[PDB]
Design a protein that fits this description.
Layout: E1 4-7, E2 10-17, E3 23-28, H1 50-60, E4 66-71, H2 76-88, E5 92-96, H3 109-120, H4 125-139, H5 146-152, H6 156-169, H7 172-176, E6 189-194, E7 198-200, E8 207-210, E9 213-218, E10 224-234, H8 238-249, H9 259-269, H10 276-283, E11 290-292
Parallel strand pairs: 3-4, 3-6, 4-5
Antiparallel strand pairs: 1-2, 2-8, 6-10, 7-11, 9-10
Helix pairs in contact: 3-4, 8-9
Length: about 300
């Protein structure tokens, strides 16, 4: 209807992400004291001019909301500096991770382990190792959830887990935060999430994505899913909910193959009848006006 793309036996409609679809950048800052107490606490050096990259994108995308999704122990002056950015560029909206409620996506670690123990009493060495070690995991802070444990890391896991959850909320994250001037967002709408290390050279316009989703792929003989661009047309996109179900069902993280990636591949090709390369070709986010990792 806006066309289709077929993959692994299913025809996926190409769906539009129009100007109502906001851009989102994330900055989770472990050491906010490295910035001035009244400065914007986002790196903006010659080498990594990330704030400038974001401002440029906001200027170019004059008809779109630009989100800056942040976390960290910012000072009041830093919060005020972020506020001033919002006044100066009327489409820029700062969203603090503090202000968002993710409890609908959370789960107690005990529940996960019990479910695992129950299944794993019902073929292999892997399983018996799995069973003992999970059993062990339970015995150990009993109120802990996925959120509370990730709340303890201030590293990549903290960033990644919250990026992924944000993407489940999509445009709703702006509404939930109560941001001014967000009347054009579609409730239940998506977002175009971007690494701040990028150059936008001109307007994106409307994107047409298979089932409304696409991801950064890097390509010399090799190809890989990358996490610098994730675009979705709607909140709680089912391919992302798949990743969440995986996180909800598994005791242990896998560092190279994250749950977002695993969920995408599982949703689009649970069987793996097409190779990784074919999946990469299918899902790839490609736009001539974006240059990734300029720095």
């Amino acid at each position: 209807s806006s066309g289709h793309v077929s993959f692994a036996g299913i025809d996926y409609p190409l769906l539009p992400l129009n100007h109502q679809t906001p851009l989102v950048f994330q900055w989770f800052e472990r050491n906010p004291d490295r910035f001035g107490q009244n400065e914007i606490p986002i790196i903006n050096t010659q080498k990594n001019p990330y704030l400038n990259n974001i401002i440029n994108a906001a200027i170019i995308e004059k008809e779109r909301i630009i989100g800056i999704f942040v976390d960290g122990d910012f000072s009041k002056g830093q919060r005020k500096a972020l506020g001033k950015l919002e006044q100066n560029y009327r489409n820029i909206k700062v969203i603090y991770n503090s202000d968002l409620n993710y409890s609908m996506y959370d789960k107690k670690l005990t529940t996960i382990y019990l479910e695992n123990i129950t299944k794993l009493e019902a073929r292999d060495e892997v399983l018996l190792n799995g069973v003992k070690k999970s059993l062990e995991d339970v015995l150990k802070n009993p109120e802990e959830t996925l959120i509370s444990s990730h709340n303890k890391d201030k590293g990549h896991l903290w960033f990644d887990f919250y990026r992924n959850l944000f993407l489940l909320k999509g445009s709703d994250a702006f509404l939930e935060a109560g941001k001014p001037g967000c009347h054009h967002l579609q409730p239940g709408g998506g977002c175009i999430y971007l690494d701040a290390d990028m150059l936008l050279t001109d307007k994106l316009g409307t994107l047409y994505l298979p089932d409304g989703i696409a991801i950064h792929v890097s390509r010399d003989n090799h190809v890989s899913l990358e996490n610098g661009i994730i675009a979705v047309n709607r909140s709680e996109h089912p391919a992302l909910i798949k990743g969440l179900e995986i996180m909800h069902s598994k005791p242990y993280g896998d560092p190279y193959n994250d749950w977002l990636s695993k969920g995408l591949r599982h949703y689009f090709d649970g069987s793996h009848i097409q190779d990784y390369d074919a999946f990469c070709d299918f899902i790839e986010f490609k736009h001539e006006n974006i240059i990734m990792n300029t720095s």
